[model samples]
Target: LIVPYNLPLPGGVVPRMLITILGTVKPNANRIALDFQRGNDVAFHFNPRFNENNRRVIVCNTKLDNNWGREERQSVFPFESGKPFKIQVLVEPDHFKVAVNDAHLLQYNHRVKKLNEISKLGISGDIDLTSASYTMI
Candidate 1:
């Protein structure tokens, strides 16, 4: 139904916070993206571009000035068609620890500082959103 689901965070990303996403993948899904946006810049981006058959690469990066820095990646793509997954992010003071279905996936450093400015969580492409909520320790 709805897509590109963007939600505002009153205090952006605070250290030690946890963000969790629950969603179901559509059949023939080609791509999925999640960004921690700081107004015009995205402090962190998580992208999964699916290839034909069983191949995929996950990209995590920092975006600034409409440009991308180095593309941090991992070859693990655990997503499957018609399946629901729980994606969670654990925020560290210097980096982010991301997990899929309660298991570790990848990590990205907070290269673009001013964590409080990253006030929105943006999601787009090929899925049914179920939850966008968070808690911290």
Candidate 2:
């Protein structure tokens, strides 16, 4: 279940915008991704894989110039199948810090530092979206 959304960051995703996604993972879910993108380049790839590396893991990475960077999987796995979750991504000067259900999850450094270029938000895979909203911080 992949869906793309237009992020109306009127003056570009300034430091005040906060991204929120509320959803529930299906019991048979294999993975989920919330990608903040600019054209073909993905600035932030938030992926939680239920069946990767023979275990559940949350992988964060970036794609630029048609190339994918090293995957970051050092964070704790805080998501579970058949569970409702809340995810928040805060924009910072050098990185985007993510929080799940009010608990700090992980952070991904800016791969494409020009934040304004990120005009799209895409959510996909084995999850049922309950709600999604963006607001000023």
Candidate 3:
């Protein structure tokens, strides 16, 4: 995998499917972002921030037709700079479950309900991507 990685989530998402990302923080890293999208609209946005007021947090959001909706955030950080971490996103009919290194992070309820139309997966920001893959569960 690479920074700014993008993939076609073949045939779109289905319940019980899992998306995994393995990466390491850059020394002095600031953030990392992951998303599921359709066209230019983002269905899910999972962003981890390390430098917001020196508070480590994750922000979840959605963007549709160039407008951003409400955002969801959490303050627990499971990643350390220069260390490797595992992130998992589970697709369910009603929401997405996100976890880091087996620790449950948060669940973002779906705003774009046509899950099958969420055909893209993307990641960006500060980290060295080791691998990103999809699996059926």
Candidate 4:
């Protein structure tokens, strides 16, 4: 099951805005994704896995021009089954820094360099999202 929320990144993402998501991880959750997209290209894919090969991990990747980039994995796992969590993605001058439960998680460098091309934010997967908000600066 998947539910997508529409977020328009007008004039591209600046360094001061904050993207936040609050949700509960289902006990049977396999994975969940928070994606920043531009047309057919996924500028960023923030995915957490609870059942991929039985490993609890977070993977970040980018897909552009019909090609998928290399995946970055983090050993720090903050997501728990049947527990509510908050994720924050901050746009920086050079990269996107992510935090889970208010703790620093990981960052991904810009592969799709044109930040203006990022026009939407999407959330999808095996969990229920209570809220998703953006703090504009």
Candidate 5:
């Protein structure tokens, strides 16, 4: 994940950002989610996995129990071309959700069979982070 500070680029302002965690992945035990604690109103974007040639990349949403889950939130922005953004993530056991600008996006679905077998998570294009930390659960 790419984390940025308060100050953004002068000419590059990104108004509408959809950050979904992606990229090279290894088996990990922690199911992940995001938390934009200091910021407010952003949404996470999630896409499914697809095949390229004979190789494959897993792009699944995180899952959680409704009884233990909190309400999801989202931010509405007609995002621009140069504004800056920052976000953080949390890894749980069964879900991988994102906080946009501090809002909620899609929870990644589990692509692997053995829950404890996942090792790596990827942050993908455009969206950036101010600072990031990871943990095992």
Candidate 6:
């Protein structure tokens, strides 16, 4: 996501946010990535297709639309802020193996149409960013 610290928002206050995943991915490629933060209760979400609403920020407080019933929902790990955190994801042929702080978090089943649906990625949050990277195994 295109974000910078100290930027002015509609309310004129910077959000003490955590794990803002932004950017795109390949048109037919399945992507698996994670965010590491110093705090607990981190969340992940996607930007809406329209800007008129203009609510692009994603966090634990933001709940994914429970439209397609419980099966369509993603999983969330409880806050364990006593230690650092990292999100681990396995991009397989059909679904994604996901984890948090080395603890298995959840599996995200593919839903989009195209295979190579992920490209660029952006992450920025109020928490200290120790490191963020991508790889395949």
Query: CA lDDT of each candidate?
Result: 0.88, 0.81, 0.90, 0.85, 0.32, 0.33
What TM-score number comes out for model 5?
0.33
Between candidates 3 and 5, the one scoring higher on lDDT is 3
- Top candidate, metric lDDT: 3
Ranking by lDDT: 3, 1, 4, 2, 6, 5
Model 1: number of backbone collisions: 0
Give stretches of model 3 more than 4 Å off: none
Q: Model 3: per-residue lDDT, tens digit, 1-137? A: 76899978977899999999998999999989988998789999998899999799989899999898998888888889899999999998899999899999899998998889899999899999999889999
Candidate 4 TM-score, true structure as reference: 0.92
Q: Model 6 segments beyond 4 Å from truth?
A: 1-78
Choose the strongest candidate by TM-score.
3
Better of 1 and 4 by TM-score: 1
Q: 9-104 in candidate 6: lDDT tens per residue? A: 122111221222223332332222232211221122322111124422212211223222122233343223233456544555555455555566
**TM-score of each model, paired residue for residue:** 0.94, 0.90, 0.96, 0.92, 0.33, 0.43
Better of 1 and 3 by TM-score: 3
Candidate 2 residue-wise lDDT at 9 = 45
User: Could you tell me which residue pairs clash in candidate 3?
Assistant: none
Candidate 3, residue 60: lDDT: 89
User: Distance from true position, residue 78, model 2, in Å?
Assistant: 1.0
TM-score of 2: 0.90
Q: Could you give the C-alpha RMSD of every candidate to the true structure, in order shown?
A: 1.6, 2.0, 0.9, 1.8, 15.1, 15.2
lDDT of 5 by residue, 1-137 (tens): 34222222122212232223322222321222332211222122232222324333323233332122223332232122234543323333444444545555345433333433332333433333334334332
Q: What is the lDDT of residue 16 in candidate 4?
A: 71
For 1-137, candidate 4 gives per-residue lDDT tens digits of 23656667776677777998888888888998988987889889999988778788898999878888999998799998899999999988789999899899998998878777787888988777888878965
